[PDB]
Homo-oligomer: A and B are copies of this chain.
């Protein structure tokens, strides 16, 4: 069973506002004139360019799942080229974790749910035919919906989530199935700590040197003893960011370890975590 991705005429996008700018182009918010929903527009502002947008659209359309940014349509016009997705109103994980004045507390149930949902999403990509690999997993690429549920995106930067064997890339390093789990381990650490990994280091180049020798600090300072399931978590972090790519777990194995942890949290506590953020 096949399904075509809708084509959205640029003029059907009303109330267009700039959100961000960088690599792969600019991101804008808008409303669909006929659908009456708020949308996000990732666009370029010539033939090779056209093919890139069409390829991203196809991946996003095929990667359709509960914890993946939902694509709504494509703008493929002489005057405009862009990807139209659902609008994520609560920014990224990065902004939740590090805007500490705006967000004083981020309750453990919400933190563990975010971790469980990142793993559910990456796991799904890894189970496609053929497997889909992110290879640029970072806190900026973890979008949060209205109820602070995860949608994995790719904004198209930091080296802190990169496995050391990816530093000098090749045909084997780009085909690595143990890259995402390294990034996940650092994300897992950054979520439980609310600390910028390798904060004390001066140069990203020095971080690369440090990393290649053999990680961000696992102590009482960074990770206090009151962290729910601390031991099992630390064991998962250490295991995921292990210098030997073969000494790294699958996302399925992490999920199986995470499933009992999430059950120790009462359903109400997730709703209370979110009300606390508003």
Contacts and interface: CB of A to CB of B under 8 A. Distances in A.
Interface of A: 1-6, 34-37, 54, 57-58, 61-62, 64-66, 70, 72, 74, 86, 120, 123-124, 127, 129, 146-147, 149, 252, 255-256, 259, 267-268, 271-272, 274-275, 278
A74 B3 CA distance: 14
Contacts of A146: 147, 149, 267
A58 B275 contact: no
Contacts of A58: 1, 3
A34 B126 CA distance: 10
- What's the number of copies of this chain in the assembled complex? 2
| Majority DSSP secondary structure for residues of A touching B | mixed
A144 B75 CA distance: 31
A54 B268 contact: no
A274 B147 CA distance: 11
A1 B61 contact: yes
Contact of A4 (B1, B149, B272, B278): B1
Nearest to A73: B1
B259 A268 contact: no
Given A66-B86, A127-B35, A267 B275 contact: no
A34 B4 CA distance: 27
A35 B275 contact: no
A271 B1 CA distance: 38
Contacts of A65: 35, 72
Given A1-B54, A61-B1, A278 B267 contact: yes
B3 A36 contact: no
The 8 closest A-B pairs by CB, nearest first: A1-B5, A2-B2, A147-B147, A36-B255, A3-B61, A271-B275, A268-B278, A3-B3
